[PDB]
Amino acid sequence: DRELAILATAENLLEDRPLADISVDDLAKGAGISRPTFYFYFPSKEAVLLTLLDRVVNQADMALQTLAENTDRENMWRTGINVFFETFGSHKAVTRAGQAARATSVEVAELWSTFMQKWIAYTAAVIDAERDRGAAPRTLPAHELATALNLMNERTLFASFAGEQPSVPEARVLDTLVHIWVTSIYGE
Amino acid sequence: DRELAILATAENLLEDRPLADISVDDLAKGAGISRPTFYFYFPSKEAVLLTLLDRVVNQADMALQTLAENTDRENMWRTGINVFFETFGSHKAVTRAGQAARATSVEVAELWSTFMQKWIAYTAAVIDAERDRGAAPRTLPAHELATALNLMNERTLFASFAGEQPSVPEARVLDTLVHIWVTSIYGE
Ligand SMILES: O=S(=O)(NCCC(F)(F)F)c1ccccc1
Numbered sequence A, B: 001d002r003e004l005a006i007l008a009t010a011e012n013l014l015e016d017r018p019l020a021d022i023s024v025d026d027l028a029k030g031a032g033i034s035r036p037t038f039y040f041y042f043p044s045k046e047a048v049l050l051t052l053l054d055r056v057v058n059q060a061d062m063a064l065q066t067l068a069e070n071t072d073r074e075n076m077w078r079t080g081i082n083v084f085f086e087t088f089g090s091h092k093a094v095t096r097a098g099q100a101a102r103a104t105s106v107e108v109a110e111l112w113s114t115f116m117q118k119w120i121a122y123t124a125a126v127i128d129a130e131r132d133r134g135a136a137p138r139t140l141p142a143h144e145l146a147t148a149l150n151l152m153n154e155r156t157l158f159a160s161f162a163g164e165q166p167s168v169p170e171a172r173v174l175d176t177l178v179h180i181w182v183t184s185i186y187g188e
């Protein structure tokens, strides 16, 4: 209600400047409420970012679950990486501010860490199933391969979304990651 | 002289706490000099970190040049990745503080960005030479493949050195990266 208005204002202002340059008064004004009324819904602007990040992370996670509960192996991995490309790619300002807040908020670091562990455990489970069915060779420990591939995707997606130098162009980043996943999972 | 003493004190204190919890007075005391004498050598504690990072980055870069100016393809890539594993792995506190300072220092962000561009251009040149000699297939654009692999290495090395959750164990991180480089460069 007022909560959704605060969250929407925060995501809007984060497209223009960092959390550090946004004040509680900014979030209040944008949401059409007073400062004290803002503090009824959130303890701080930092808690507003944590909620936005939590919604984006849960949206990716729910889309991955939907995929899992339902093509060739290259398209299977592409469809799964694409959940993260589209979800985070649709919320670049929250992605960029959320990643930066990992350095200064234990809650943001622990949220990111919890979901990364889940997504790595899922990637490793799929590699093991591919190994069990005889489609993938038993090369690296599946969990170690999964970890490296998930960290590559974290760094490479986020560098592309932020336009970092260096970065893969956003229009080339899906094909780039899929090639590296498929060759490293199926290759000897 | 006093400069090396300041740099050595800073690298020592960075093994115990972040730059934010180290004062100019701390660096002065450790180096056996006054605060005003410290400011003769460096404008700030931030400039001390930038110099330490610059020395570590140049040490990796010089070791890579030595390798380039001088085994099978898997060992060739392993020896090159190992420059970064050993160099950064030998200076974990400077690595960790330098990476964090990318968020708050334009000079640290631009130093890291300059060397990443150089190391990616070198990786792409080697992939192209492997493609020219008929040892690697023409799959992804070499520069885009190089970018993704260099970013994977940045994120995965630094997560392993910092003991992050998640991370590849430090004792498994070289073999993990080499497998992904070799399969993604030589694989179709
Ligand atoms: O590695 S993933 O593409 N996403 C995790 C990393 C990040 F969130 F993008 F940062 C991935 C994980 C699980 C299944 C398919 C793809």
Ligand SMILES: O=S(=O)(NCCC(F)(F)F)c1ccccc1
Residues within 6 Å of the ligand: B064, B080, B081, B084, B119, B120, B122, B123, B149, B150, B151, B153, B154, B155, B157
């Ligand atoms: O990708 S690399 O291992 N190092 C760049 C990344 C970082 F510095 F480690 F962060 C690499 C680059 C060039 C040749 C061999 C290996």
